[PDB]
Amino acid sequence: TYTEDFIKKQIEEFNIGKRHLANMMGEDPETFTQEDIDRAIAYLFPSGLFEKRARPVMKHPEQIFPRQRAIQWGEDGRPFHYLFYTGKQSYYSLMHDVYGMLLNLEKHGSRWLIKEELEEMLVEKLSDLDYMQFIRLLEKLLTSQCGAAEEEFVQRFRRSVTLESKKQLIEPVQYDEQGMAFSKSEGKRKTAKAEAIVYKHGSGRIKVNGIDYQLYFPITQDREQLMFPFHFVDRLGKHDVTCTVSGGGRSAQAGAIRLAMAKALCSFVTEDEVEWMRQAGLLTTDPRVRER
Amino acid sequence: SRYSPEFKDPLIDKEYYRKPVEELTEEEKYVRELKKTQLIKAAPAGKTSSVFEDPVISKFTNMMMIGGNKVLARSLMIQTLEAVKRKQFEKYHAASAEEQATIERNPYTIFHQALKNCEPMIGLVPILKGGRFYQVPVPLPDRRRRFLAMKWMITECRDKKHQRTLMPEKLSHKLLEAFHNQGPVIKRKHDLHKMAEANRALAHYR
Amino acid sequence: KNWLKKFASHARLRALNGLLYKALTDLLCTPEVSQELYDLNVELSKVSLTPDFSACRAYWKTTLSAEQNAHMEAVLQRSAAHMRHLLMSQQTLRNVPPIVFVQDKGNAALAELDQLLAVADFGPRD
Amino acid sequence: HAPHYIAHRKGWLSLHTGNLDGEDHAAERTVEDVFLRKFMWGTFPGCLADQLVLKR
């Protein structure tokens, strides 16, 4: 067990060690920060162990050692919080606040906070059912015409899961020396790697490694594959393509080219068509590869 | 599988997306909105938005394939279609004025109708309960009979009594016989529907 | 008897099976149990008594619809106890074990097979 | 820690260039390591609290 005197001595030792490390690395001890400590300890004690926690670490004793309870009452004996005797002062204080916000309104891409990190925020163990009750209150608050402060309060209890699955990244339109607008993109299928350049205006001329596509791809199926992206958005005969592919085989090269042309063509179609191409599987790298 | 459970299979249908927002119902609107969040698998080599795509012929080609040789399988399928088309044109030019209205020259129509004429409606299931195997009848799912038509056609065309007749010519002849409700495959369907009628009492065992 | 507290608080087997089959069919023939049960027209296939006489399983023929099957099952399960009471009150049997209604899935097979065989194609003149 | 943690949590007791791609004399260094470990364990009996670290 770690007595408070032990933690105090550890804090003093860490401060002196921080000043020593700043002396060693030539940096000013005053502005020396934890990122600087991490960089310096990575330089001085190089360790490529895969486990980041098995590497040398110089952290504040507060961070590295566990924590303890807080005092809930002073020497007079009176608890600080008015909901102390419930035994769940933090949770019920939060519920009380939410109910007051709902009363005020009644007078007038992301994920819900999960139970364990709610416990961390409240610093109180709570059951499943009371977690559900809190989440139902939060949902009820969201449904109402919540204001700015209310939306911030709700944002306190919602982390991110990312909404970018909606949106594929659109390449920027570049200009060649002739003044023709084009867009470049890359794709990969098995070991085949392709880079395509799609010109805004064209007549459907596709050049693979400086060769016409029907001569590079004798098999009809590969030409079907190259046709798929433009055909999907009804833009056959409206672009010129200059692609370079390397590695893989016949079908892997065809698929890599198809992905590269789809990603490059994303620049010249509407956002709705970008989403449609995404839902058709035309913008997703195929990860299926040979297993060991 | 290298795809996680989140990934969903893509929808290659080109006319689905062009459907107007006005025609969308609330349910279909919700499905469309939901799909936006979801991760989609890369479309596989094969199906395409091409207007000539035929899933039935693609499956037949995949079932003729041996050892991953899809180029040869597709070559055989296209040769079979060409042979069917040429035989129908030959039969059409030698026909009277009135007989030319009832000669089909579209090979895809003939192929689909031939595979429809070979589908068994009912089948048999080996079930040994009393120490003796009992073949009980069962009605087949649509997928099962659709598969059985193709499997019987391919097995019939691979039979070794057909000696040095190349695959496209055998397959076209079998398809044109099955188009007119003739040939050994229609007989195999009938002799299954008869062995499933001669055991209509064993159904209760199921 | 102070009922308020109580409420608040093998050849022989085949003969009994046949007797209970006839009795349960004749009970289902009328609104004696309830009008809702009568309107359903529930048909029984057989009656099977467990070898220790702890339960009487009455197998009722299911229909093709699913919502009808669920409604029939609900009504039958709700009416089992009253049927047991009537069977003992009419003295068809002195003691009747609890009645369990079990769907029969051996009839749908023959129905669907006849449906398929009535439109299937057979060989020339065969 | 078990042998399958040798590059994850543990390190290597001996360090030299022999086992690198293109280098030579791996076997010589290994035999030297074995003799060094036996010699030290016999010359410091009951003193060594942990394994030796042979650096080159």
Are the beta carbons of B183 and B177 closer than 8 angstroms?
yes
User: Among B199, A241, A269, C123, which Cα is nearest to A277's?
Assistant: A269
Chains A and D touch (3+ CB pairs under 8 A): yes
Shortest CB distance from C116 goes to which of B122, B191, B206?
B122
Contacts A286 to B, Cβ<8 Å: 41-42, 44
User: Among B136, B166, B172, B128, which Cα is nearest to B153's?
Assistant: B172
Long-range pairs for B30-35: beta carbons < 8 A, 24 or more residues apart:
B35/A279, B35/B8
Contacts A165 to B, Cβ<8 Å: 36-39
Count of Cβ atoms closer than 10 Å to residue A66 Cβ: 6
Cα–Cα distance for residue pair B124/B135, rounded to 1 Å: 6
The three-point CA angle B149-B154-B157 to 5° equals 125
- Name the minimum distance, in Å, from the CA of D11 to any CA of chain A: 8
Cα–Cα distance for residue pair B200/C16, rounded to 1 Å: 31
Are the beta carbons of B149 and B119 closer than 8 angstroms?
yes
Per-residue b or e along A98-125, where b marks 16 or more CB atoms closer than 10 Å to that residue's CB:
beebbeeeeeeeeeebebeebeeebeee
The three-point CA angle C26-C32-C37 to 5° equals 85
Q: Helices in B131-180 by DSSP H: which ranges?
A: 142-157, 167-179
Place of tokens 């060693």: A24
Using CB atoms and an 8 Å cut-off, which of residues 251-280 of chain A contact chain B?
251, 254-255, 259, 275-276, 278-280
Cα–Cα distance for residue pair A227/B77, rounded to 1 Å: 21
Which bin fits C41, alpha (ψ -120 to 50), beta or left (φ > 0)?
A: left
Are the beta carbons of D48 and D40 closer than 8 angstroms?
yes
Choose the mutation target among B17, B72, B78 for the interface with A, i.e. most A CBs under 10 Å: B17
Contacts C114 to B, Cβ<8 Å: 200
Choose the mutation target among D1, D5, D6, D12 for the interface with A, i.e. most A CBs under 10 Å: D5
Which tokens hold the place of A25? Answer: 């690395």
User: How was this structure obtained?
Assistant: cryo-EM
Assign A109 to helix, strand or coil. Answer: coil
CB within 8 Å of B41: residues ≥ 6 apart:
A281, A284, A286, B3, B7, B8, B9, B10
Place of tokens 């029939």: C72
Distance of CA A84 to CAs A78, A130, A260, D50, Å? Answer: 10, 17, 63, 53
Q: Looking at chain A, which residue has its C-alpha nearest residue B78?
A: A220
Place of tokens 């899809």: B70
Distance of CA B150 to CAs B52, B193, D24, Å? Answer: 20, 17, 63
- Name the minimum distance, in Å, from the CA of A55 to any CA of chain B: 31
What is the dihedral angle through the alpha carbons of A135, A137, A138, A144, rounded to the nearest 10 degrees? 150
Q: How many CB pairs under 8 A join A and B?
A: 74
CB within 8 Å of A265: residues ≥ 6 apart:
A183, A198, A229, A230, A233, A235, A239, A277
User: Among A28, A25, A29, which Cα is nearest to A42's?
Assistant: A25
> Which amino acid does the sequence have at B57?
I
Tally of residues, chain C:
126
Are the beta carbons of C98 and B166 closer than 8 angstroms?
no
Chains B and C touch (3+ CB pairs under 8 A): yes
- Name the minimum distance, in Å, from the CA of D40 to any CA of chain A: 27
Flag if C117 and B190 touch (Cβ within 8 Å).
Answer: no
B121 touches chain C (CB under 8 A): yes
Assign A99 to helix, strand or coil. Answer: helix
CB within 8 Å of A11: residues ≥ 6 apart:
A60, A61, A62
CB within 8 Å of D33: residues ≥ 6 apart:
D14, D54
Beta bridge partners of A24: none
Which bin fits C91, alpha (ψ -120 to 50), beta or left (φ > 0)?
A: left
Question: Roughly what angle, to the nearest 10 degrees, separates helices A220-232 and A271-279?
Answer: 140
Using CB atoms and an 8 Å cut-off, which of residues 191-220 of chain A contact chain B?
219-220
Cα–Cα distance for residue pair A207/B108, rounded to 1 Å: 33
Distance of CA A170 to CAs A87, A155, A275, Å? Answer: 54, 29, 11
Query: E strands, A24-143, where?
Result: 110-112
β-strands C99-104, D14-15 pairing: unpaired
Cα–Cα distance for residue pair B116/B121, rounded to 1 Å: 11
Q: Looking at chain A, which residue has its C-alpha nearest residue B53?
A: A224
Assign C110 to helix, strand or coil. Answer: helix
Contacts B44 to A, Cβ<8 Å: 281, 286
